[PDB]
Every structure is written in C-alpha cells, then in structure tokens.
Write a protein that binds this ligand. Sequence first.
Ligand SMILES: CC[C@H]1C(=O)Nc2ccc(F)cc2N1C(=O)OC(C)C
Ligand SMILES: [Mg+2]
Lengths: 519, 403
Amino acid sequence: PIETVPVKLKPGMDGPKVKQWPLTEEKIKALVEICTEMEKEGKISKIGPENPYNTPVFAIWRKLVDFRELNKRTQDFWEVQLGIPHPAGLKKKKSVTVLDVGDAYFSVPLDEDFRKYTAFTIPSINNETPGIRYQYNVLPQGWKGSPAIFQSSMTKILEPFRKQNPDIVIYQYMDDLYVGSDLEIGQHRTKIEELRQHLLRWGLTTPDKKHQKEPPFLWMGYELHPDKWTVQPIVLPEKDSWTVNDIQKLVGKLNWASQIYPGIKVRQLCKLLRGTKALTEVIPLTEEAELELAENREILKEPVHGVYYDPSKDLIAEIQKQGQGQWTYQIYQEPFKNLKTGKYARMRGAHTNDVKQLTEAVQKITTESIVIWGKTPKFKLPIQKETWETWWTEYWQATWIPEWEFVNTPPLVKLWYQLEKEPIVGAETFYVDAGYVTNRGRQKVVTLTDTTNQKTELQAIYLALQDSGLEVNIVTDSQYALGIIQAQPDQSESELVNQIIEQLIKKEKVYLAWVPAHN
Amino acid sequence: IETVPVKLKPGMDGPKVKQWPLTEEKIKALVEICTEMEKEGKISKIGPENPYNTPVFAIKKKDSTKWRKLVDFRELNKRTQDFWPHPAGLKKKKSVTVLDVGDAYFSVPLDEDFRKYTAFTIPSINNETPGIRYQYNVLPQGWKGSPAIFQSSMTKILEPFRKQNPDIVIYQYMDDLYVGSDLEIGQHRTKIEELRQHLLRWEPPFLWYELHPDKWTVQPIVLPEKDSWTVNDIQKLVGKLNWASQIYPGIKVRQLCKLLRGTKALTEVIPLTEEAELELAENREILKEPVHGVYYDPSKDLIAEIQKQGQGQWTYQIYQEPFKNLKTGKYARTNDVKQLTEAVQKITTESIVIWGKTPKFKLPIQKETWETWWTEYWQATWIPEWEFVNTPPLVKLWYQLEK
Ligand SMILES: CC[C@H]1C(=O)Nc2ccc(F)cc2N1C(=O)OC(C)C
Ligand SMILES: [Mg+2]
C-alpha cells in the first residue's frame, strides 16, 4: 500500500489512559456492529488486556472517538495548509471537476508502533461478557496527524499521475480534489475517469460523473467558474433600525467585497460605531451613512466577475487616492479586465503625507502580488517622478518603488509645503518655549489647559506660525516637534498638528531649527 | 555512524521559522538547485512528521550567471551547542581576497539525529501546491556547526600551503575563507590561484576581488569651517558640540554660547570673539581623534547603525556600549535598498575581518520593503542579525561631512 509515516508522542509523555464513560446498552450494541466491521475492513484489531492505554468513545449510529487527550500527547506535525489560493491567481481552464475523496483517512496506514496509543474500549453489556479492546490500523478521524498524513500521502499518490498528465492542474484541499484542464469536453471526462481509477487502485473511492458537483464552485467565500470568479451573492439588508451588531456585520461584508467591487466605501458606516455602548444598541443612520449605503447597494446590484491570471501577459497595478488616508487600486492584465481590486487605508504612524502613504500602498500591493502571482506588477501612479524623488532624497528612511509610470489621473499626489533648508533673511524670528519672543520684540505667553508636555511644545510653534507673516524662522528646543514637522506630514490624528499643517501650507517660507536647553 | 554527534543547547527545540514568500524566478532556481542536491544524496525529501523549518532564498553571484541557494540558519545557529582563534594580523594585510569554500561541506555526512532540524520548504506560488520539503544529509552551508565540524579536515588540507607560504594569513569564517597578503596586487591574485587549485587538490570562486583593510581609517566628527558665522550656524554648532560632549567631555561651549546673547535674527552675522575662536579651535582638536579607552571585548554584542545621508550617502557606527564607537565610517555609490544591502554587507565583512563576528544591525527601513528586496542584491553567504528602526532627525546632522 502507501508507505508509513512514523509518529511519536511528545517528549516525556506517555500514551492516553482515560476511562470509558458508561455506555447505554443500546449504544454498546451499535458500537459492536460498527467496531466488528472496522475489524473486517482492516481499520482496527482486537488487543490483549495488557495495553494500559485507552481513549473514550461515545455513539452518535456513527462511532465518534474522543481524541482530545491523545492529541495533547501526540507530536507536532508540519502545518496542514496555512494559506489557500486566491481566485485572481488561478488560471483559466476549459473544464474543472471537483472530486470528493471518501473515507480518505480510512485508506491510509498508521505507524504500527503508534497504534497501541489508539486503544479504545467497548464496554460489555453483561457485567462480564466481552469488554473488547481495539486499536487503529489506519488514520483515525479526529487525530492530530490525520490531516497532515493524509495530504502528504495524497501528494505522493498524485505525483506520477501528474508526471504522466502535465496538462492537468490538480489542487488538493482537505477533502476535495479540484481537477482542471483545457482538454476538450470528452478527453477531460476520460482523464477524470482514469484519475478516479488511479485513486481507487489505492483504495481511495470517489463519486461518479453523475454525482460530482458542477460549477459554479462555491469555495472559501467565492464563486468559481472555469473562466471567471466573484464573491458569492451579497446585497445589503433593508431596515429601519440598525444595531451596532448589524453595522459591524455590514461593514464586514462590504470590506469583503472590496477585493472585486471597486467603489465600496465604509467610512460613514464605520463612524456610526463611535461611543457605542452595546452590541444591541440602535443607531439611526446619518444622511451620509444612508448615501454611502444607498451607493453600496447599487454597486452591489450589478455583479462583477474577475478574470483569471494569464501568465503570458504582464501585470499592471493602478492606484488612486479616494480621500484623505484612503486608497483604492486594481490590478489587471488585459486593459481594464480586473484580476483583482482592493482598498488601502492603513496609516502607519500618527502622521504622514500622501507620498509616504502611497509608497506604503505600493509595498502592500507588491507583497500581495508576490504571493498571488509570484511577481510584481508594473505600477501606474498619480504622482510625478520629480515629486517622488524630491521626497525620497530628503527622507531619512530608505525606500524603493519598482518600475512605475506616472498617470495623470487626479487627484495627483504632491507635497503641500516644504521647509526651507536655510534660515530666511528678512523673516522675523520666533524663539518658542507656551509662548514666544521674536527678534523684533514681540511676545505671546499663553497658559494652556489639559495639555501634555509634548502637545505644549507643539502649541508654542503653532502660536508662532499664526502671529507671523508669510515668511518666518522658528526656533524650538523640542526634538519631538522637530521630528514631526521635519517629516513634513499633510495629515495627522492630532487636530493641533492638522492646524500647524494648514498654517505651513499657507506660508511662503518656513524655516525650523532646534537648540537644546539652558528662551 | 561516521558523523559527529551534534545537539542543541540544553532544553532547546528545533526552529519553526516562517518562510517569506518568494517570486517564481527564485522558486524556479531553488527547484532546479535542490532537485540536483537530492539526486546527489545531499538533501532528502521529508514527511509531515518533521515540524521544523528554516527559510531558504536564491541569490545571484559574482562572475557567474548561476544562482546560489542561501539558507537562513540564523535561528538554528542560535540553538546549536557551542563547540568546546582570531588573527588580528588579518586587518593589517595590504589585501584580502574572500573565497567561497562552502562547497567543502558536502562531503561530511550530518549526525542522523540532527538532520530534522535542517528542514526547509520551497514554497509555491499562490499556495497552489503544499510546498516541497527537505532536510540535510550532509553539513549544510550556513550552519554554525559546519565549519566547526569540518575544521580538522580543513586544517590538514591547509597545513601545506600554510607552512609553504608563511607570508599568507588564511582565516575561515562560516562558508568563507579570508586570504591576506602584503604582496603586490599584481602577484597577489597569482597566489590566490595557487590556493584555489590546491583546494581542488582535495571549487572556491571569488566573492567581491580584494578588500584593503590597511586603509580602513575611521570617520571622525568634524565641525563646519566657514568664513562668516550666522546666528543659525552658531546654534547648529553648539547643538552639535553639546551632543559630542557626551563622548568628549573636554568640549566646552560657554564662549560660543555668549554669542547667542538673547533673541537675535537667525541670519544675523556674528563675528567670533577671541575667547571663542580659541574654544572652537580647541574643541576642533579634541575631535581630530576617536575617543580613548574604547576596547572591544568578545563577551558582548557588536551593534551597528546606519544613517541615510541623502544623495547616495550613508554613515554608520559600530559599538558595544553607546557612545563608545569601535569604528565609524561612510558609504556612497542604484536605489535606497540596493545601497543599504551593500553597506550592510560591507560593514559585515569588516566586523568579521576586524573582530571575527557579524554585528547586529539597526536598519532605517520599513521591514516589508527590506524583506521584499534584500535578496535581489545580496551576495554574501552569511546573514547578520537585524532589527528595524526610525532614525531620529538630529542623529544624521551630527554624523556627516557636508562642505
Ligand atoms: C484546478 C484548476 C485551478 C485553476 O488554475 N483554476 C481554476 C478555475 C476554476 C476553478 F473552479 C478552480 C480552479 N483551480 C483551483 O486550483 O481552484 C482551487 C482554488 C479551488
Ligand atoms: Mg527655545
């Protein structure tokens, strides 16, 4: 048969010895008919009462064994999956067949040396009739290593068939065997029968062409066709009173659709959750939430498909700024035939500018692309090279964007301001420490309330910016404020920072300098 | 049987490190390479009972169009038992050529019971297939135990060349062999060949061409030297000085400070007073040399930070205790990431040459960008430890040579 994967118990630990809870005589009978046949098939074997090990068993009839103890003692195995494919990476096939693999775990031997730890007991009806003890000869359902051992066996059992038929794509997933090709209808159905026979000659039985699922294949939240994909049917609920819970589930489903529905927005909706006190709390919808909801249900009313990846053609990724801190993008090959789309809103840091944030979106998209297609796309960006270099060269962190082409599709991203690199001759000079003193004798000591040593160092500067003219030189002792302004944000979480930013955009020339303590 | 029994440090278990996703080009190179290492018994396909993992990568090389497999054994290297010198003569040689002798390892089998810890996975695009799994049968390139275990055999082999060419300093580190000689560059490369071929006797292509340790002069702190000094200049100068006073306490500011008397316009020009010209000149002298009393002790970690100086320039420092730099340098001449990786390697090749250890790097780059691009430019056979940070504003100021 198929080779055996050796298994071990964790270091130190000993097999399981948990006693069988009382079993109803109606259940004992059932289990004896079930266990006696499993011994007729090869699954199990009776063992002499010297095997101290035992694992509980109840009846549902189907025998369901409770392995949560043996599992705790069984060695760690190599991860069963950790990652399913994304539709956008799949290739277009002429035919795709899904083959359910029955009694999968049942058709795979279990390391002999390990079996004695799979010992279980069927209690005798009579206070002294059987009292039989069994152990497994194959992979037990519910046992820690069955998914891993099964998949690893299937891979080997598939290898040859795969060498013989290199024009057949086969994807294994737990219990399903998705088989695809570009063969003509007839030839495909024959390969699907051969394969079916290949598994069988290893004991693995499958469903006939009559009983096998036909696409669209509903998988992991998607709807798969041989030639395209989308997310399963989902339009929004109609209601008068929305509960926090409903909102969160709503926001959840709209996001999910973003991978293929460009235009979905969740902001006004998300905003409803502010200060919410209970999942069951009602929240009426703002005029803006209703508009956003109304537009989402319209976008979600006309279904959109996503074509598959054609490896012969390049990958193009195009990004757009859809609001402050909001980015949308779509990756396509055939001009505008979307392989995938998505939105990006992550603000890494308390402050940033559209340039840093667009660059971070390019890294997220790059990483994503490497996972799904194994390469990075040619990027189309709403930013000119000169704006880019200009912030690049002057920033302290190191960064790098792959080959990209500027695309004049507003809003174009840019820097709203820039700090001079040299003090300005003829501009008044403010020394701020919560107030300031100018070289022309002006002063504005103001005592703030509910402040923070840091928010105070930022208010100093803000005051100086307001009372000063179009050109100004500012001197601060704060390394902190210095860091923030010098990074040249155009957006922040802080309103204060946002105020300073509006101020900086208005100035003609601003020069910031730092000096220590001792003003 | 023949193998040397190796164990992990006490109590430690094998590495379970996540494999960063790779591009199909690299996977393609990794499949071709590993298929061959398997046909030759170097590595074996493993089953699901091995739970361990170490990441793999493919890189390009020097003087070749072929790919090199690079196994990130950092984690395993740290869980591997210690094995129970270092020629300071090396940093004094006129030249040093670096050789890749990592191949010498594929002859010594590996303790059968340790193999499972060398497990690695070749990933698949978009998760469409499980991932090809393997473990080592022989000493693997990149593992701390390989040089240690092949040491006997490596001395025996070098024994001859050693006595025969006493004018050469041959130092080994991981998969690399360092060859130093004050001979003229002309004859230098000729003597390297007589070593390569003497290795074939029992192969080794070049890494980098030579390095010249002799002129690895430190990059001291400098103050601007100008004709007229504005108020802004004096403020930058004092700020710089005050921070440098953390290292050199002989630095005095008092006089220059009496210049920023009050609130003067930033651009106002301030002629320097006698008391002051002398204070600057004297602080100037203290900085001409690196601070005394800075000694390296093998007992602690070597930390290295790099700063972006803009316009293709970077600065860096090596220390064990803050402010106590063992070395501080520069690097210039591509894109940000390409440079960062070359500097990182250049600075690593230096700590190895100077102290025999790779330093811990503090890099100024978002992690995902580094993880995405470092392999496109990496040429070394080793990988140093690194963490990611943000470079404060003023640290750069205080570290470069602007005119
Ligand atoms: C088997 C061929 C493979 C593929 O390249 N394209 C398609 C197209 C349509 C499908 F229904 C499935 C798949 N495929 C696949 O692996 O699907 C798993 C993610 C479920
Ligand atoms: Mg001040």
